[PDB]
Design a protein around this nucleic acid. Sequence first.
RNA 1: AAGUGUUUAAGGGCGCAUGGUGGAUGCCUUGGCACUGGGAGCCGAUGAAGGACGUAGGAGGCUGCGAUAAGCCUCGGGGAGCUGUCAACCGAGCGUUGAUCCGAGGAUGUCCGAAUGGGGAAACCCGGCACGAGUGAUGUCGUGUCACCAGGCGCUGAAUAUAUAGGCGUCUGGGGGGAACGCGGGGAAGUGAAACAUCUCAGUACCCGUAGGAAGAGAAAACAAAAUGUGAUUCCGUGAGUAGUGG
RNA 2: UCCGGCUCUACCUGGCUGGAGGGCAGUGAGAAAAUGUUGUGGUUAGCGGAAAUGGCUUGGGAUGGCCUGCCGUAGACGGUGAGAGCCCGGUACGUGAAAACCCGACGUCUGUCUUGAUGGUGUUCCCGAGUAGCAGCGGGCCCGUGGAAUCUGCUGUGAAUCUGCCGGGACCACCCGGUAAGCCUGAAUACUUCCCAGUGACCGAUAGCGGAUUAGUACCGUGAGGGAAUGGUGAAAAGUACCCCGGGAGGGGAGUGAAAGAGUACCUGAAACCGUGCGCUUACAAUCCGUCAGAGCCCUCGACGUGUCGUGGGGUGAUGGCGUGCCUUUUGAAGAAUGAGCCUGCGAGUCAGGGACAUGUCGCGAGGUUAACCCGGGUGGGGUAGCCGCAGCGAAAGCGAGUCUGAAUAGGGCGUAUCCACACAAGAGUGUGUGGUGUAGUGGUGUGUUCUGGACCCGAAGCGGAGUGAUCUACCCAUGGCCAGGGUGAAG
RNA 3: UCAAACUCCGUGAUAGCUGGUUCUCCCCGAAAUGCAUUUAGGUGCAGCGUCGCAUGUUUCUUGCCGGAGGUAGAGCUACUGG
RNA 4: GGGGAUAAGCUCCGUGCGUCGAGAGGGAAACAGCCCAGAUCGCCGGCUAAGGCCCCUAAGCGUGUGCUAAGUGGAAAAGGAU
RNA 5: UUGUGCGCCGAUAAUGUAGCGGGGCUCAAGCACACCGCCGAAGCCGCGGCAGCCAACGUGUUGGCUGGGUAGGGGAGCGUCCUGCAUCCGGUGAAGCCGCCGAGUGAUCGAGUGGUGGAGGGUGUGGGAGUGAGAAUGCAGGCAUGAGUAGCGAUUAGGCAAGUGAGAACCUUGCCCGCCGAAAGACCAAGGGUUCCUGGGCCAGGCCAGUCCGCCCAGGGUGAGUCGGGACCUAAGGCGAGGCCG
RNA 6: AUACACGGCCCGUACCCCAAACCAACACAGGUGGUCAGGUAGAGAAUACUAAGGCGUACGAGUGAACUAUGGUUAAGGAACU
RNA 7: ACAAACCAGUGAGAAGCGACUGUUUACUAAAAACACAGGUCCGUGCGAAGUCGCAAGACGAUGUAUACGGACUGACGCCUGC
RNA 8: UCAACCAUAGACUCGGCGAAAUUGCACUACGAGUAAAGAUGCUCGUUACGCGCGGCAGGACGAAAAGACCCCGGGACCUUCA
RNA 9: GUGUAAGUGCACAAGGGAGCUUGACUGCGAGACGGACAUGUCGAGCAGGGACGAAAGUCGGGACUAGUGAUCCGGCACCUCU
Lengths: 156, 124, 63
Amino acid sequence: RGEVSGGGKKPYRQKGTGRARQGSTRAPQFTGGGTVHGPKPRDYSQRTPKKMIAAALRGALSDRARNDRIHAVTELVEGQTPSTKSAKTFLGTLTENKKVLVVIGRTDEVGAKSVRNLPGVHVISPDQLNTYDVLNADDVVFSVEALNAYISANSK
Amino acid sequence: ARVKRALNAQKKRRTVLKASKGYRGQRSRLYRKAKEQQLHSLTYAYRDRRARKGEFRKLWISRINAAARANDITYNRLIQGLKAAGVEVDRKNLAELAVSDPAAFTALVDVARAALPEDVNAPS
Amino acid sequence: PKAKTHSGASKRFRRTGTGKIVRQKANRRHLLEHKPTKRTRRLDGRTTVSAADNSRINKLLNG
RNA sequence: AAGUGUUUAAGGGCGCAUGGUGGAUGCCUUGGCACUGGGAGCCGAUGAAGGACGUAGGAGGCUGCGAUAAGCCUCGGGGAGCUGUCAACCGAGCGUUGAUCCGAGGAUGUCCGAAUGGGGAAACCCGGCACGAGUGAUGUCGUGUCACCAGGCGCUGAAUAUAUAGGCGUCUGGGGGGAACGCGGGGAAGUGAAACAUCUCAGUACCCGUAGGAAGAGAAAACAAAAUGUGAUUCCGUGAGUAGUGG
RNA sequence: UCCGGCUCUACCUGGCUGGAGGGCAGUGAGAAAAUGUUGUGGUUAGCGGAAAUGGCUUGGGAUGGCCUGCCGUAGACGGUGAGAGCCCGGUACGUGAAAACCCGACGUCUGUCUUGAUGGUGUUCCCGAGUAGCAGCGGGCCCGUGGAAUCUGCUGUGAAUCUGCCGGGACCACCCGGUAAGCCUGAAUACUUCCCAGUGACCGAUAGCGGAUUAGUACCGUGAGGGAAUGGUGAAAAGUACCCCGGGAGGGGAGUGAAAGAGUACCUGAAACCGUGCGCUUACAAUCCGUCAGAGCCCUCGACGUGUCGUGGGGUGAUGGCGUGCCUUUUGAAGAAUGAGCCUGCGAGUCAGGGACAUGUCGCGAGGUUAACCCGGGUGGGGUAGCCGCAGCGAAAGCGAGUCUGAAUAGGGCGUAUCCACACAAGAGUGUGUGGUGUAGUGGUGUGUUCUGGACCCGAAGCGGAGUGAUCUACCCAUGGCCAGGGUGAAG
RNA sequence: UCAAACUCCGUGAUAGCUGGUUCUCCCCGAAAUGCAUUUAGGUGCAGCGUCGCAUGUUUCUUGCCGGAGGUAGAGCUACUGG
RNA sequence: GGGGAUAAGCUCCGUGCGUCGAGAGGGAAACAGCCCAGAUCGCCGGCUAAGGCCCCUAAGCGUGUGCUAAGUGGAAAAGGAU
RNA sequence: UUGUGCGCCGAUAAUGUAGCGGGGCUCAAGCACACCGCCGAAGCCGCGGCAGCCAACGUGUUGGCUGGGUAGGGGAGCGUCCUGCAUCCGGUGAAGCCGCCGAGUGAUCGAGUGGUGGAGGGUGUGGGAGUGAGAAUGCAGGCAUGAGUAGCGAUUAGGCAAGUGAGAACCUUGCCCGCCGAAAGACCAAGGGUUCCUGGGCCAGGCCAGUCCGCCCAGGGUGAGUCGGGACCUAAGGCGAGGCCG
RNA sequence: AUACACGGCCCGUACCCCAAACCAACACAGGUGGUCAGGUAGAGAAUACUAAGGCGUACGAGUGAACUAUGGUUAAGGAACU
RNA sequence: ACAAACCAGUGAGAAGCGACUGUUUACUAAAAACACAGGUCCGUGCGAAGUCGCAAGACGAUGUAUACGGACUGACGCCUGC
RNA sequence: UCAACCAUAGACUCGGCGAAAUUGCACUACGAGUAAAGAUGCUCGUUACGCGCGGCAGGACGAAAAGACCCCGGGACCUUCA
RNA sequence: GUGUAAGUGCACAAGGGAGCUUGACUGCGAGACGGACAUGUCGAGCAGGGACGAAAGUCGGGACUAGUGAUCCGGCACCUCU
């Protein structure tokens, strides 16, 4: 009611009119009036601990590994000719599933682009690995450099 | 998110107004006034389901008293004689007999008159 | 915003190691002639606050 | 003879069936809100911002434009329909010899408005000077120009002598607007303190003066504490709701 | 480095000033403009951009379903007659600027050094004056005048130039630091009228901007200023030719349409409310309006037998019994105490914070955790500064499983996580030693209360700031106008 | 409209006051007392409720036992008074 | 028990006193606070409490012995009264 | 004469019996004492269902006890919307709305059905809420009650004929009558702003109707040396170069 | 001085203007300054009637109700009303 | 019945208050209240005093103590005591 | 006293347009009671065919205005040797 | 009679008298009373150094219960604190 336009003046005398008491036309009960306890902009970012995050990631990848859903490859396709046909066929060999998480370095633009337009595919970098994407994936597919990067980051 | 509440709100209204069919005036037409009466109506129904046992007992007793006094005995001494004769028949069925089998009622009256003492106004 | 602690309560109350809240005792600043020394001794030092006042005192002290 | 006995609906009530009003609900949207990332962060006396009045072949509103008036020139782009729109209809036309449309640069740009030739109830009244046009001449028309203040420069230098104040001329500039942010100043009260004045609210709101795209501050007459210490300023986090301050 | 001319004058020797090689920088705070050439550097228009007329079926229509293929650096988002990667705009991706503008680069050009620096020895001069400092009154600093430094305004007074001065929280000494009273200075920082591209566990027409619509409009007000309401036919107007009733409106036929139960009053089309029709009921009755029982009537579903019965269901309700509305607030209201005409919508414990307390849960664990910030087109990875725990007692110095008090080994306070066993003292309530067990917090997050905030919502009279108003009204100023007719009869 | 106009802003002024505060069921279940209060229609604490944790019959009832009282009643030539 | 007129549907206290409050149901004609009794729901089953059993109104114009003549019952004082 | 059990008087208000709740009761249906049965509650019992606490035994059944409830505390849930994920339905008709037939201890449910309708929804598991209204003399819209009720706006007064027209108390024409006549006439200013005129119209407006209109539409209409104003003058007062003050 | 020939600008000008067009939310019994001021009676701009001129001004038709309002008349009495 | 209608003073006596004419609470008070002329007191020696203004400046006043301002009283008569 | 009559405008009737405050409901009786101590709504009785029209105003503690008196709380303005 | 109100007590004396004295102390205080909290109250006993007493023992003000004022702020004296 403070942010709404107007409503500064009392609409009428407090007494005499037979009307209810009012102090602003923009009060909440009024049509056109303020929202009492409404949404305001707020940041929902929880301040999650690092060990909790990492442990969740590792649990996700461990579920996938136990159920044999982690595959690894050298490269999704050959050099500098992004071929979604090739990537699709390759992932079809590796897995019949819809939901796939491709983990590849930030420099494998060719493989990224080749596998990008596939519907059930999500591409990520190993330094950005996350529980949500890993769990939304029915299968995970690392490049070898990306896998070993995750390994060498999480070992020491 | 913002929620238009008509959809959840109209349900109780439909319920109440469908329950309040047969009511006169506002009580059948308006939620706020049908609601007032459904309170009273269900209070009354709860009360009356329990008073109905008493009312039907009252009725059965009236009929038993009638048939008994036609067989030349009071209700009280009839009940006394039946309890002394070990007749566990309930007043409902006694009334039904009084209406439908007056001969059987007379037989039970004879039973009770036998089972009664010789001086009902004595301490014994 | 950070919750402020009540200044007077932080000046009049103190925690021990076990979390006991203690207080100095009144009737000791002045008018001490007629106050016998047994009384002033009783009023000396510190005492644990009452169970009744504990909640309010802890609220004031913490914020 | 005595007794029993329906049958009425002027209208009403309940239910059902069909409708009407009304515009809820559901599903939408041409709109809006909060944000993000970038740009640009000023516009104005070469007349702004914002407007009045007009302007299309046809009445008005919005839009655009300005007596060159839904428009003119050039440079590109684009490519076949077009003559903005409410909103059609009529009547006219244009267009591959490239329209409409898009972008950039220019031109024109009435009148008001700082508004500035003078006046004025803003958008309308009256002019001077120069040049030019037009008239038998006066009238009339057009193009420029003509405010105030400051600062320079040049001439003059009152009472009055020095000389100055001032006056004349010329040149450069300002003037006003703008959502927020900034700097410097001024500075409440409701309120809270369960009263109230100190205090708080709050250096808030508001106001004033000023800017810049950022500002301000800034290169120690600083901190520090005996550590061979750090080494402009600003900002962020902590220190810490601590030390302290406080009717 | 070279040359020249001065260097009062010519003569030997000491400084300056021009020219020349060269550096050194530059449109910058560090001096200032202009000038060109020039960057597939950018912005201001855009352009290209793969792949299905696929079959069958439903349908008005395929963008649905089933099945076939195809592209994919393009399955982003929309549109198209219904969920479209392959129909369209487009997307990924790649191209594109004549001119203007902005960034650069190269140079012209400008400035400066270039007669220059190098490193040493002992005295006089200078090192920012109405200043500092001091006093008085004030301001602001955590600091509310307090012992009140530092900083700072006004008024007075008023110094020193380095063995000088200022600050190091009154002050003095020593020591340290610095060198005021002169100027400039980018970046990190704050913001968005406006422009572009995008996003939303944001609204979706009583919402969301007041404004999806004529919107700061209409309207209100003298004025400042206040300030609305109004969206959806259909896929396409195919927007109902024509006939009939009618003055028209409106309608009926006919037609369009998939649908007119889509007819510019138009998607769906609730309720209040208004009617019409059918069934039942009601005109001897005292009714919080219903409930319980229930006659009769009507309808319906089954059965048998053919209309009476049922494990029945419904609508009506004669009649009998019982029965004092809802809310609020109250000792207590049916209450003749408050509020509500009805319906539909809207309308009130929410949000932020490493906040506080408690609790739950998860992680780790005597450790836990990062904040700002950095890198990441993300939710991820770094980040040890700090924070909480880890030893307390004490006013504190300080001491330390002890410590404070106190003259005390003499008791008490607080603390030594807790428990177990033993031993010794006691039975003034139990203690003291030994051994052992060995201490559990922290950060996320949910919940409940709470703090600061509008803080569950509504509500004053009134206070303040800045402005609008004397076209009403009060008074005044200037200038004009009006006061039929008849009487009385002052001074002079 | 005047015992200090109006408008906007501060401002969602503050109100120990009034009103309102929207779905359900299950279990438990008060108080209207004390003290203090620029307090008395408010509030703090205690009392009373609930939940959780810990303890476990300590509660409560009855019987018996040990106890202190100065009421009722009675008495006053046992006091003070009448 | 105080105050009050040993008045108030008065007021102020006390009472391991009650009920209402916050408690329905039955009785008391009706009637929060009296009596009975503490409502988990259902039943067209039974026994009871208080209170009642001529009809309203369920149950008795009950039995026995007396009393009452005033409709006492189904309000009332000092006091009067073959 | 004593005491007692029943009685009498005292007795005495005002809407209406009205001091048994009523009828009526002494042929007690009144009082006392005994006695006998019965009625009578949501109490108790019986049969069945549910929930809470606890116990036992077994790794979910039985049993016991309890289950009124305001403020209030705790627990567990329904429904609405938006969402992550996974699934499912849908132009062979989703939602919403209206119903039928039903279901659940409750909020409520209906992947049961029809109708209407025309495009998005359901379910499970989590996440988040502008999450539930009957009340605030609440806000907005729509619609009732009063109610087809009051009123239809002065103090002058209308009438007839004829016409027009679909339609006339009201419009037009004519004739009468009546009203004003220091006005209810004529002209200006201020103010308004096209209301003027012509033609046309009649679903809004006009307090009825309406062929009429100050309403709607279109078009037309305002001609100045002398009128009222400026270009002439000044008053009050205002602005106010410079200026002073702040 | 005469004659001839010429220029005389800008705004307003319709219409209502004691009102249905202005201020009054309305076609509102209110308000709105100025100028003309006929006749007969009459002192007169009063008042009555009337001319010129303009209206019948916008819901009507009826009907002997009470009652209300506005006007009128009133026996005898004459403020007894109040 | 002759001012014929319309139009068009009611009058007298006394008291209180206020001298009077006027003004006033727009929208419940028109009055005995306010003002008034008249009176007294006080101030003011002049960009006075007083007032609006921070100041300048302005009014006072284009006035100058027979004037100006403020206060009280309120024609007039008799008076106005301590 | 003491009121009667006449007209007109309304009221009444017909036609036309067409509000309002109010409103928890409703097939809204009376008595004596009872009750938050003044009852259409409860008890016991009595009375009452249903629906309208004109009228009256006793009640609906009638409508209107969140009582102005009183008190409590808070304001405002005013006064003063606060 | 008990310093002084009243009550409880005191004759064993707590009442009256005399002598000596300063315990009308310092550090502490088991345990209790009372208790919303803050307040308040009693206290054996240990030590120090004392008074009285032959000694036992008593003495931390008064026969008891009232004779008083939180906190803030500041003052004074002392202190091996800062």
